Design a binder for these strands. Structure first.
Ligand SMILES: [Mg+2]
Lengths: 238, 157, 60, 147, 31, 29
RNA sequence: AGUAAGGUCAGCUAAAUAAGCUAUCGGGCCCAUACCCCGAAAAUGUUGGUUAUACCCUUCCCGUACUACCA
């Protein structure tokens, strides 16, 4: 064998649920593009209906020459009122949920406009270290397959993940402390694999102490400075 | 001249791809993928066309060959809703589905993970992304149906 | 070896009795070919003037 | 039978061969085709000239837009470079540790495609939402090739 | 980013005016 | 009868194996 | 061995909107059949090229036709 220990890590990421809010500069550009679009657009059927209805009122008030009585029951402006009333009654979903208010970094319902990365807490040498989910490589199994096996080893989860490619997205090599450092086990070589969380969530048995979901900006709170640097390379915050 | 050392200085066709005249689908190797179709489905025509332009420009900057950029036929579906205290379906709105397809090839297996990550992160709201391997059926779906050929084929059956 | 079967309405009495019966016999062999899973290829078929058969030839 | 059944099938094949070898027409795209209703001059809205201040505001906004998009491209371009450098470095480390696993890592993924991803919604789905009752009717025009 | 290619306009010489609307889906999501 | 060139011929640095992947001029200027 | 010419509804001809007749199918007429009456269906030898096609050219194939002489 080799002195280093093969480890296959899974970089499970939750894609954003809602679109990111527009920047103040983009809001100005968005209004201009909408303004330009209206200027260069032809009259729509709704616009043509309003113009003709206004003319009919003039053709009915200035002179009594109109030869039709029924005309149209509902005017264009009146028709807009019905649409406006329905919109007010309808309530949109809350982009910022209770998880954001309570800072519940366990649920997936937080920061729907950002990217969440799964983190778990594992105890090594009577020390709690936050690392990405990982498992030890076994004979007769691909390196990517170990990461797939890591998902099945989680605490009561029915999550489905979509792995992208076979080559690892990154690596992290560390050596054990000199107290237990031996030639047989010099250290370990962690390999990261990214996947997309399609559906599923952990059960309500254990939440706070088991796993957390944080973005790249707040990812440094849990990871070690040496471990954080390697993770921040293959994890994007676009 | 042939005997002079400057022979062949004027040769130019060896620097030009031979263009000597539908298209055969080239399957990828064990390390590269074959011809891929990047479908872009959205209910807004502007969003579908704009993102297809973004994908087309992204591939050029990534040195990924683009086989062809084309638009699939627009699908129009009527939307009807049931009236209150009634059993009659009344038309509510008309929705048109616009699909834009960008065809690429020669994508590396290792680079596929990076390419797919970038495009999915930039996907606009209301736009559906679907990347499929190019097949003969997909290409044949862009052509008008031929009932006359079908009628003759039915006789043979 | 394949058989070229022929049926002919013999001239033995008046009417179309001979001719009508030839049609039944010809259909019997055609149906018997299907029962034995034999290929029945029609060669000649001359119908009579009253829904019968004058002479018919077929290959089995 | 020999002069009727056999001859009928031969002529059917001839018609099939002519149709199969004939050129196939593409389905027209309604998006690119301008409807004739838009050609009518009645729909042409009047044009209002922009003021000097309005044109100046747009020109400055476009100039700021060029720099904003350039910075977006730089962030995206560096993101691709950061991923590529990490992935290539990881592959080199894997090859040194175990050449056999490196060979499997660089192989293509048959299950990767088809890859489907839907864009984020403006609002999250309502946990308890009751959509109205209705029916979807397809009215897409069918185009057929003749002659 | 979802705003990478979202700020667009109709690139047509002749086209009817289009209005920004919210499409409520069956799950309550809107686009 | 042939005579070898006295120096580097034009377009000798062009790699013909990857001609498809080589960047073209695409413009007159 | 050479050269001419022809290839079209099942059949035979006319035209190249590929029609008419017979045959064929369905109905009526008749105790029945045929005739008759109504209605329907049915094809360019093949190859490729002729803006594009067809009547054209041309590839190939079946059949046809004339010539093969003087010492
Ligand atoms: Mg009759």
């Amino acid at each position: 064998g080799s002195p280093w220990r093969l480890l296959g890590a899974l970089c499970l990421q939750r894609p954003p649920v809602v679109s990111k809010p527009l920047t103040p500069l983009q809001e100005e550009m968005a209004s201009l593009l909408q303004q330009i679009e209206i200027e260069r657009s032809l009259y729509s059927d709704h616009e043509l209906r309003a113009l003709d209805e206004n003319q009919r009122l003039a053709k009915k008030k200035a002179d009594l020459h109109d030869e039709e009585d029924e005309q149209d029951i509902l005017l264009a402006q009146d028709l807009e009122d019905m649409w406006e009333q329905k919109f007010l009654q309808f309530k949109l979903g809350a982009r910022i949920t209770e998880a954001d208010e309570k800072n519940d970094r366990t649920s997936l319902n937080r920061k729907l406009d950002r990217n969440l990365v799964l983190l778990v807490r594992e105890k090594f040498g009577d020390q709690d270290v936050w690392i990405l989910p990982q498992a030890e490589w076994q004979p007769g199994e691909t390196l990517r397959g170990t990461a797939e096996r890591t998902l099945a080893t989680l605490s009561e989860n029915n999550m489905e993940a979509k792995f992208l490619g076979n080559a690892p997205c990154g690596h992290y090599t560390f050596k054990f402390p000199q107290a237990m450092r031996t030639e047989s086990n010099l250290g370990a070589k962690v390999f990261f694999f990214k996947a997309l969380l399609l559906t599923g969530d952990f059960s309500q048995a254990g939440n706070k102490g088991h796993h957390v979901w944080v973005t790249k900006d707040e990812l440094g709170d849990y990871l070690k400075p040496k471990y954080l640097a390697q993770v921040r390379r293959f994890v994007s915050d676009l | 001249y042939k005997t002079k050392p400057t022979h062949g200085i004027g040769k130019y066709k060896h620097l030009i791809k031979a263009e000597e005249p539908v298209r055969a689908i080239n399957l990828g190797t064990d390390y590269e993928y074959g011809v891929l179709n990047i479908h872009l489905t959205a209910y807004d025509m502007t969003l579908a066309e704009s993102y297809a332009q973004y994908v087309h420009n992204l591939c050029n900057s990534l040195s990924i060959k683009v086989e062809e950029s084309y638009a699939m036929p627009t699908k129009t579906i009527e939307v009807l809703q049931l009236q209150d205290q009634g059993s009659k379906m009344l038309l509510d709105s008309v929705l048109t589905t616009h699909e834009r397809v960008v065809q690429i090839s020669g994508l590396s297996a290792t680079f596929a993970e990076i390419f797919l990550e970038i495009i999915q992160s930039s996907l606009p709201e209301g736009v559906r992304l679907s990347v499929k391997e190019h097949t003969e059926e997909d290409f044949k779906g862009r052509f008008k149906a031929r009932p006359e050929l079908e009628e003759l084929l039915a006789k043979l059956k | 070896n394949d058989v070229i079967l022929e049926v002919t309405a013999g001239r033995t009495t008046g009417g179309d009795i001979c001719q009508q019966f030839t049609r039944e016999i010809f259909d019997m062999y055609q149906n018997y070919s299907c029962y034995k899973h034999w290929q029945f290829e029609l060669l000649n078929y001359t119908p009579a003037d009253y829904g019968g058969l004058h002479h018919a030839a077929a290959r089995i | 039978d020999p002069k009727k059944d056999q001859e009928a099938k031969e002529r059917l094949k001839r018609k099939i061969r002519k149709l199969e070898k004939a050129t196939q027409e593409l389905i027209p795209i309604e998006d690119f085709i301008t409807p004739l209703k838009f050609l009518d001059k009645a729909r042409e809205r009047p044009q209002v000239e922009l003021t000097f201040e309005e044109t100046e505001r747009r020109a400055l906004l476009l100039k700021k837009w060029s720099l904003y998009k350039q910075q977006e491209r730089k962030m995206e371009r560096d993101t691709i470079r950061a991923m590529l450098e990490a992935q290539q470095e990881a592959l080199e480390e894997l090859q040194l540790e175990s050449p056999k696993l490196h060979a499997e890592a660089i192989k293509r993924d048959p299950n990767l495609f088809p890859f489907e991803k839907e864009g984020p919604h403006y609002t999250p789905p309502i946990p308890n939402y009751q959509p109205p009752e209705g029916r979807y009717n397809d009215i897409t025009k069918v185009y057929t090739q003749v002659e | 980013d979802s705003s990478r290619a979202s700020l667009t306009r109709v690139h047509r010489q002749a086209y009817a005016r289009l209005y920004p609307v919210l499409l409520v889906k069956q799950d309550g999501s809107t686009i | 009868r042939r005579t070898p060139p006295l120096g580097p011929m034009p377009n000798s640095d062009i790699d013909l194996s990857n001609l498809e992947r080589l960047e073209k001029y695409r413009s007159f200027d």
